[PDB]
Design an enzyme around this catalytic site. Structure first.
Site, PDB file in Angstrom:
ATOM      1  N   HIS A 117       0.847  -1.091  -0.129  1.00 44.45           N
ATOM      2  CA  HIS A 117      -0.105   0.023   0.025  1.00 44.45           C
ATOM      3  C   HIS A 117       0.939   1.170   0.143  1.00 44.45           C
ATOM      4  CE1 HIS A 117      -2.489   3.001   1.821  1.00 44.45           C
ATOM      5  NE2 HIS A 117      -3.318   2.675   0.832  1.00 44.45           N
ATOM      6  N   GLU A 175       5.136  10.834   3.076  1.00 43.23           N
ATOM      7  CA  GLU A 175       3.734  10.026   2.796  1.00 43.23           C
ATOM      8  C   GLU A 175       3.586   9.266   4.076  1.00 43.23           C
ATOM      9  OE1 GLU A 175       1.289   9.746   0.002  1.00 43.23           O
ATOM     10  OE2 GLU A 175       2.767  11.530   0.023  1.00 43.23           O
ATOM     11  N   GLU A 210      -4.485   7.879   7.320  1.00 45.25           N
ATOM     12  CA  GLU A 210      -5.212   7.070   6.655  1.00 45.25           C
ATOM     13  C   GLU A 210      -5.994   6.370   7.905  1.00 45.25           C
ATOM     14  OE1 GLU A 210      -3.194   6.089   3.149  1.00 45.25           O
ATOM     15  OE2 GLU A 210      -5.355   6.338   2.160  1.00 45.25           O
ATOM     16  N   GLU A 229       2.204   1.985  -3.343  1.00 42.53           N
ATOM     17  CA  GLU A 229       0.944   2.595  -4.242  1.00 42.53           C
ATOM     18  C   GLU A 229       0.996   4.025  -4.170  1.00 42.53           C
ATOM     19  OE1 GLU A 229      -3.161   1.459  -3.273  1.00 42.53           O
ATOM     20  OE2 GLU A 229      -3.776   3.137  -4.457  1.00 42.53           O
ATOM     21  N   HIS A 230       1.355   4.744  -2.976  1.00 42.06           N
ATOM     22  CA  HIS A 230       1.374   5.960  -2.876  1.00 42.06           C
ATOM     23  C   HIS A 230       2.721   6.447  -3.637  1.00 42.06           C
ATOM     24  CE1 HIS A 230      -1.450   7.106   0.382  1.00 42.06           C
ATOM     25  NE2 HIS A 230      -1.688   5.743   0.454  1.00 42.06           N
TER      26      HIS A 230
END
Ligand SMILES: CCCCCCCCCCCCCCCCCC(=O)OC[C@H](COP(=O)([O-])OCC(O)COP(=O)([O-])OC[C@@H](COC(=O)CCCCCCCCCCCCCCCCC)OC(=O)CCCCCCCCCCCCCCCCC)OC(=O)CCCCCCCCCCCCCCCCC
Ligand SMILES: CCCCCCCCCCCCCCCCCC(=O)OC[C@H](COP(=O)([O-])OCC[N+](C)(C)C)OC(=O)CCCCCCCCCCCCCCCCC
Ligand SMILES: CCCCCCCCCCCCCCCCCC(=O)OC[C@H](COP(=O)([O-])OCC[N+](C)(C)C)OC(=O)CCCCCCCCCCCCCCCCC
Ligand SMILES: CCCCCCCCCCCCCCCCCCCC(=O)O[C@H](COC(=O)CCCCCCCCCCCCCC)COP(=O)(O)OCCN
Ligand code: HEM
Ligand code: HEM
Ligand SMILES: CCCCCCCCCCCCCC(=O)OC[C@H](COP(=O)([O-])O)OC(=O)CCCCCCCCCCCCC
Ligand SMILES: CCCCCCCCCCCCO[C@@H]1O[C@H](CO)[C@@H](O[C@H]2O[C@H](CO)[C@@H](O)[C@H](O)[C@H]2O)[C@H](O)[C@H]1O
Ligand SMILES: CCCCCCCCCCCCO[C@@H]1O[C@H](CO)[C@@H](O[C@H]2O[C@H](CO)[C@@H](O)[C@H](O)[C@H]2O)[C@H](O)[C@H]1O
Lengths: 75, 124, 438, 54, 63, 383
Positions: free
Chosen positions: C49, C122, C129, C52-53
């Site tokens: 994940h 990030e 999140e 992906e960022h």
């Protein structure tokens, strides 16, 4: 091209139909056996049950053929 | 019996000329001797209401019809407990004895019976 | 009859799969990868994940800003998602912007910077999140459902990963992850809409030819999960709506019972009080629920993985004093899959599914998702004729046999969120998985 | 185990039938076994043991 | 401690063979045995107890 | 909040006897329920008192009843009250059941109180039958003999069951002592079922003579029906007084003042008057087992009224044809009663058969047909 869906209504009564009931027929059978075994077990002590049913079963049936010796019976 | 049954059978009778010639006069006499009009009821006021279908039909009555029905029931209850009959304008006249509820219950039942049929459909 | 899906390979082992539609003007091209969070261990959980960022944070050539501009100039958009077993990166564009989009995707996948400065930036975005998924109740419920059903196993892990890992993920372990997993034999380049297959194969030879091959190339969609009957209760009296999921161990993509389980799922079906037609649905549960106002919605699911699945139902309800009834009637309808179902329900559900499996594919993105999913789970696109034959082979008596071994008297995984005081303890729920009358 | 479960346990009708049949068997065999055991621990003491003299 | 996705440790209690038919069958054997003895015990109790209503020894002596 | 509503125990009493919402138009036929409760209270008080002076042993039973009559202070009153109230209990129960059938109290949503009611009626019959045996006079013994011999008709096990019930080879001491114990018990069971049928009723409330909803116009149970019940309580007590004090043996059989004698058979063995219709139904069927089945079916058939009544309207107030049919049904039931006590002689044998056929045809043929036709007449007649 299809103009209409193709179906029929099966006979039904009180929300039961033959396809459904037919699935349960074996189950009623087993419950009937359970009720039969249970009922017979409950009256296994009754002398008539032994005389008429249980003593007639092959091999096993001698379990229920029991005589009190005349010497030991007041009645 | 469903209202549907009663209505359908009655319609079969009303169609047959012979049948209607015999049944309609008998039915009118029956209604006269029944005497519900003498307590200010309409025929439909007497229908058993304690069923899901009938409770739904009663909820669909226009407010006006609903308020008037309540009054007729209360008025009849008062005549009943007093052992009196309606007089004058309280007596239901034949022309006032309208089937106000029948259309609503027929629609409720139509859907309920269609639902039962469609619950038993078999793809061909 | 839809156009045939063309399939080619490269030398490295990259699959190219395409379905052209000369009626549309847009094209979805993308890379479906047979890899996801499940490929992480406990220490690097969250890496997939995280990547992906950073895939959109700049490459060796284009900076973050140049990347933004390049896509803006193309006119379409890029999108990505990471799941437990699958990663997707796609680009929707105009017909003649397809070579640009393939080039950008090839760049972000192979030649991403993963600069320490961007990792650090990030690391906060992703931390935030963790505290905002909390609102997406369905996702909360399904993530706890996996966590408990596959307790302490890779499928049980979340995609985001724990807070601790987010703080400690390095560019080293990011690089290691994508080097080990994003190999040519695990990847499918997919084109749907206004794409020429032969053009797409050439673009693949130009951009994806220097992809590593894995040491041991297994077929696409190659995997032992041990389901745990268990429950998670997240009671919150301040929420107005209860969210409840109940599942059993379901079927994998390649199970022989795959279609049987889909038919069973369609017999229960879905319900939503906000949809006008839902009060008239044929499903028995739908009728019980709508007549008694037991729920706002329910959704049957049959989720598949490479080696396991979850089959169950997701319920939402404001009726907090009749949760017991809702759950009771739901599980009694499942019981009937074992005891009562006949050709009546089965043929109805098959009719509904024969169309449903085709209806779902209504835009280029849905078509691309279908090609990509099937190629990465089954190794091939299954034609509608084959699917129609597999559905037709399902009999009532297959459904009964399947339900008797999968549902009847089986352990469930249960998650409740919200005002769930009325949800009984585990035993009383699990006792409804059989009928004493049968 | 699967076979046994499927035949005798899965259907409650079958499970109850099996339990009742087993209870019948138990009842008959337990009776016989206790009778014999009781007679052995009380050997020589009971009427049946001295009856032959009379 | 904070994350609710990290299931508490159930390893001291978990059986490895929790999904097998053998596992379920064992527990139903225990339930079944208990039902069996309860049926046998009820039958014995009912039979012995209700026999009080059959002719007593003094009644049978005068027959 | 008032204590009567707040406290859970008080609130249960409150819900049944005080705040209970009743239709405002219940007529005097709604008073039989409280008369039945009164009969039950009298039977409990007098019965428990008789049990303090009665001896259940066959050598002493008849004499203990004479001791009650002669030596116990007010023993005559307690005995006559108990014996006569048993008859009043059946008058009230037939009236109550008659009300229920006439006014459609068995229809939805009151099937459950009606069905429990049918069981109450069976329990009353068994209670009264066993209490009658306790005197151990000639009718006691011979009535027990013939009624218990009906069980011999059960196939295969019938004879064994009879000997089991008797505790011997004929009706004797063991039978008398067990009938005492069960006669004591059965009224408590009956009280429980009476409470159950009221709890079941409380979901719909009482019906009313118009057959319509009363939700539009409710009256508190108290004071309205409390004071209305007092009128019938005092009317009942006047009837009670006339029997108990002035004619205490009018409803009884003189042969029950003769001690039981297994040798001598009485001239005619008849049940108590309230069982006579069922006895006539039994006689009508020539077969033994047939007769027993018919007799039981005559009570159990009450359970199908909710099905065979096809009317869209509750009760008979507005149904001239149903009212006439009901009238014939009731009078036929009384004729059956009369035929239960005649000798088995011409022409009463055939008459009993015709009346039995009519009894069953009410449920199976006439009520379904009449109720179907009346539905059509209401609809067509009011167009
Ligand atoms: C036993 C223990 C003793 C306790 C006594 C309790 C009995 C009370 C009872 O329920 O009956 C009284 C009861 C009085 O009840 P009510 O509440 O005044 O009226 C009920 C009906 O509305 C009454 O129906 P109606 O208003 O249509 O009037 C009918 C009645 C006239 O009713 C009266 O005037 C009374 O006339 C008759 O039909 C009498 C029969 C003679 C015909 C020839 O009398 C009758 O109903 C007799 C009719 C029965 C046939
Ligand atoms: C006192 C008399 C006891 C009678 C018990 C006789 C057999 C019934 C029994 O054991 O119940 C097992 C059964 C079943 O127990 P269960 O509910 O644990 O099993 C259900 C799941 N299957 C069918 C897959 C095994 O219980 C009943 O049916 C309830 C009756 C008990 C009373
Ligand atoms: C004997 C035959 C009796 C037939 C009764 C016919 C109706 C009638 O005239 O009764 C008056 C009344 C008429 O009352 P109603 O309620 O129909 O009418 C009131 C007046 N109007 C119509 C204006 C609203 O009926 C009763 O009160 C009937 C109660 C029945 C009780 C029967 C007991 C018999 C026990 C046998 C048990 C088995
Ligand atoms: C034999 C029984 C008769 C003796 C009791 C009757 C009451 C005696 C007079 C007392 C009285 O009238 O006062 C009322 C008491 O009644 C009451 O509180 C009771 C009202 C009626 C008495 C019994 C109710 C019978 C109903 C069911 C019968 C059950 C039979 C089963 C055994 C209260 O007057 P108020 O309360 O109206 O208010 C008025 C303002 N305080
Ligand atoms: C010990 C015997 C009984 C007692 C004490 C008793 C008592 C009562 C009482 C107090 C009521 C409410 C008031 C009333 O309507 O009278 C009632 C109603 C009722 N009873 Fe009974 N009852 C008895 C036996 C029976 C029997 C034998 C039946 C049926 C075969 C029956 C069926 C009903 C029904 C259907 C109602 C509702 C009637 C209505 O309001 O429309 N009961 N009972
Ligand atoms: C529904 C309630 C009851 C009914 C219908 C009922 C009915 C009867 C009947 C018909 C008799 C025969 C009376 C005679 O001709 O002498 C009797 C006797 C008797 N009953 Fe009851 N009874 C009831 C409740 C009770 C209760 C609760 C007891 C408590 C023990 C009891 C004790 C007796 C006794 C001791 C006798 C015999 C003495 C005698 O004949 O008076 N009864 N009963
Ligand atoms: C000894 C103990 C006896 C317990 C017996 C339990 C028997 C219950 C059988 C039963 O429920 O049958 C249901 C079946 C119809 O199925 P469905 O419409 O409920 O799915 O119903 C019909 O087929 C009719
Ligand atoms: C719904 C339930 C069904 C009806 C219930 C049946 C009730 C009566 C059944 C039989 C009762 C008498 O049945 C009889 O029971 C007694 C024990 O109780 C048994 O008697 C046995 O055990 C007793 C002591 O336990 C010994 O003294 C005796 O020597 C021995 O034979 C008889 O072998 C059996 O014939
Ligand atoms: C008639 C003999 C007198 C004794 C009363 C009988 C004792 C046993 C009765 C208890 C059985 C439970 O009975 C049940 O009680 C509750 C509260 O009491 C009633 O409840 C009713 O009254 C209360 C307030 O009075 C309301 O909150 C409620 O909306 C209403 O339904 C039920 O309608 C009744 O069915």
């Amino acid at each position: 091209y299809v103009k209409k869906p193709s179906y029929k209504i099966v006979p039904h009564f009180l929300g039961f139909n033959i396809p459904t009931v037919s699935k349960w027929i074996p189950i009623f059978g087993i419950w009937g056996a359970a009720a039969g075994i249970g009922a017979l077990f409950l009256i296994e002590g009754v002398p008539r049950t032994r005389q008429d049913i249980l003593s007639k079963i092959p091999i096993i049936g001698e379990h229920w053929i029991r005589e009190i010796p005349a010497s030991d019976n007041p009645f | 019996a469903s209202i549907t049954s009663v209505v359908k059978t009655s319609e079969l009778i009303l169609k047959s000329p012979l049948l209607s010639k015999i049944v309609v006069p008998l039915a009118k006499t029956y209604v006269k001797f029944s005497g519900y009009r003498q307590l200010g009821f309409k025929m439909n006021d007497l229908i058993i209401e304690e069923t899901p279908n009938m409770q739904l039909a009663l909820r669909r009555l226009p407010p006006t019809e609903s308020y008037d029905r309540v009054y007729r029931l209360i008025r009849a209850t008062q005549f009943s407990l007093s052992h009196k009959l309606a007089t004058g304008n309280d007596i239901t006249k034949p022309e006032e004895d309208d089937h106000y509820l029948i259309p609503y219950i027929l629609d409720v039942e139509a859907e309920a019976f269609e639902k039962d049929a469609l619950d038993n459909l078999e793809v061909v | 009859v839809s156009p045939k899906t063309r399939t080619s390979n490269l030398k490295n082992g990259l699959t190219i799969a395409s379905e052209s539609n000369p009626l549309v003007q847009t094209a979805t091209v993308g890379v479906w990868i047979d890899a996801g969070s499940r490929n992480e261990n406990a220490y690097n959980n969250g890496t997939a994940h995280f990547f992906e960022h950073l895939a959109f944070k700049g490459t060796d050539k284009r900076s973050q800003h140049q990347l933004e501009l390049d896509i803006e100039n193309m006119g379409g958009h890029l999108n990505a998602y990471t799941s437990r077993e699958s990663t997707v990166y796609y680009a929707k564009s105009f017909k003649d912007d397809v070579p640009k989009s393939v080039e950008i995707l090839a760049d972000i996948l192979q030649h991403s910077k993963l600069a320490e400065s961007a990792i650090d930036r990030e690391r906060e975005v992703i931390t935030r999140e963790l505290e905002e998924v909390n609102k997406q109740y369905e996702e909360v419920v399904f993530d706890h459902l996996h966590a408990t059903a596959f307790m302490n196993q890779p499928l049980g892990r979340t995609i985001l990963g724990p807070r601790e890992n987010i703080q400690t993920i390095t560019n080293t372990e990011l690089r290691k992850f994508i080097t080990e997993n994003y190999t040519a034999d695990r990847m499918v380049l997919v084109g749907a809409g206004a794409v020429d297959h032969d053009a797409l194969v050439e673009l693949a030879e130009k951009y994806f030819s220097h992809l590593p091959s894995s040491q041991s190339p297994v077929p696409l969609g190659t995997p032992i999960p041990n389901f745990v009957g268990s429950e998670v209760r997240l009671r919150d009296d301040t929420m107005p709506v209860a969210h409840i999921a109940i599942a059993v161990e379901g079927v994998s993509w390649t199970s022989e019972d795959y279609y049987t389980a889909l038919v069973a799922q369609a017999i229960i079906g879905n319900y939503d009080r906000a949809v006008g037609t839902s009060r008239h649905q044929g499903s028995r549960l739908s009728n019980i629920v709508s007549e008694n106002n037991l729920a706002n919605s329910f959704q049957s699911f049959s989720t598949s993985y490479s080696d396991t699945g979850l089959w169950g139902i997701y319920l939402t309800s404001e009726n907090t004093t009749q949760i017991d009834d809702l759950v009771h009637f739901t599980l009694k309808e499942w019981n009937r899959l074992s005891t009562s179902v006949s050709n009546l329900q089965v043929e109805r559900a098959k009719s509904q599914l024969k169309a449903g499996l085709l209806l779902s594919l209504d835009g280029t993105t849905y078509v691309a998702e279908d090609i990509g999913r099937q190629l990465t789970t089954l190794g091939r696109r299954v034609t509608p004729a084959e699917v129609e034959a597999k559905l037709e082979a399902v009999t009532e008596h297959d459904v009964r046999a399947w339900a008797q071994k999968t549902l009847y008297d089986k352990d469930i995984a249960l998650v409740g969120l919200g005002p769930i005081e009325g949800l009984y303890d585990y035993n009383r729920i699990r006792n409804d998985m059989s009928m004493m009358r049968w | 185990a699967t076979t046994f479960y499927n035949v005798f346990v899965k259907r409650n009708s079958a499970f109850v039938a099996t339990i009742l049949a087993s209870a019948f068997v138990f009842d008959m065999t337990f009776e016989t076994a206790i009778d014999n055991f009781w007679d052995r621990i009380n050997a020589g003491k009971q009427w049946k043991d001295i009856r032959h003299k009379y | 401690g904070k994350s609710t996705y990290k299931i508490p440790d159930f390893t001291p209690y978990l059986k490895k063979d929790r999904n097998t038919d053998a596992n379920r069958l064992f527990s139903y054997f225990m339930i079944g045995s208990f039902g069996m003895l309860s049926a046998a015990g009820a039958k014995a109790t009912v039979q012995d107890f209700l026999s009080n209503m059959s002719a007593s020894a003094d009644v049978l002596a005068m027959a | 909040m008032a204590l009567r509503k707040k406290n859970s125990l008080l609130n249960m009493a409150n819900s049944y006897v005080l705040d209970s919402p009743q239709p405002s138009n219940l007529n005097y036929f709604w008073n039989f329920g409280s008369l039945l409760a009164l009969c039950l209270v009298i039977q409990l008080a007098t019965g428990i008192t008789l049990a303090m002076h009665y001896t259940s042993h066959a050598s002493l039973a008849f004499d203990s009843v004479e001791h009650i009559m002669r030596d116990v202070n007010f023993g005559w009153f307690i005995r006559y009250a108990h014996a006569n109230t048993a008859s009043f209990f059946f008058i009230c129960i037939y009236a109550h059941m008659g009300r229920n059938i006439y006014y459609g109290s068995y229809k939805t949503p009151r099937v459950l109180p009606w069905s429990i009611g049918v069981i109450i009626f069976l329990l009353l019959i068994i209670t009264a039958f066993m209490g009658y045996v306790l005197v151990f006079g000639q009718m006691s013994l011979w009535g027990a003999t013939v009624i218990c011999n009906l069980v011999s008709a059960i196939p295969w096990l019938g004879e064994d069951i009879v000997h089991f019930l008797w505790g011997g080879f004929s009706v004797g001491n063991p039978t008398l002592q067990r009938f005492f114990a069960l006669h004591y018990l059965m009224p408590f069971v009956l009280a429980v079922f009476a409470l159950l049928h009221l709890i079941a009723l409380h979901t719909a409330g009482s019906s009313n003579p118009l057959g319509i909803t009363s939700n539009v116009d409710k009256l508190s149970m108290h004071p309205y029906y409390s004071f209305k019940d007092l009128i019938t309580v005092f009317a009942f007590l006047l009837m009670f007084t006339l029997f108990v004090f002035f004619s205490p043996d009018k409803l009884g059989h003189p042969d029950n003042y003769i001690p039981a004698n297994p040798m001598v058979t009485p001239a005619s063995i008849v049940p108590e008057w309230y069982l006579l219709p069922f006895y006539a139904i039994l006689r009508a069927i020539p077969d033994k087992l047939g007769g027993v089945i018919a007799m039981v079916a005559a009570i159990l058939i009450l359970l199908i009224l909710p099905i065979v009544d096809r009317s869209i309207i509750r009760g008979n107030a507005f149904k001239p044809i149903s009212k006439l049919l009901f009238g014939f049904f009731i009078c036929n039931f009384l004729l059956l009663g009369v035929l239960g006590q005649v000798h088995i002689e011409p022409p009463f044998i055939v008459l009993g058969q015709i009346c039995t056929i009519f009894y069953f045809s009410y449920f199976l043929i006439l009520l379904p047909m009449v109720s179907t036709i009346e539905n059509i007449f209401f609809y067509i007649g009011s167009l």
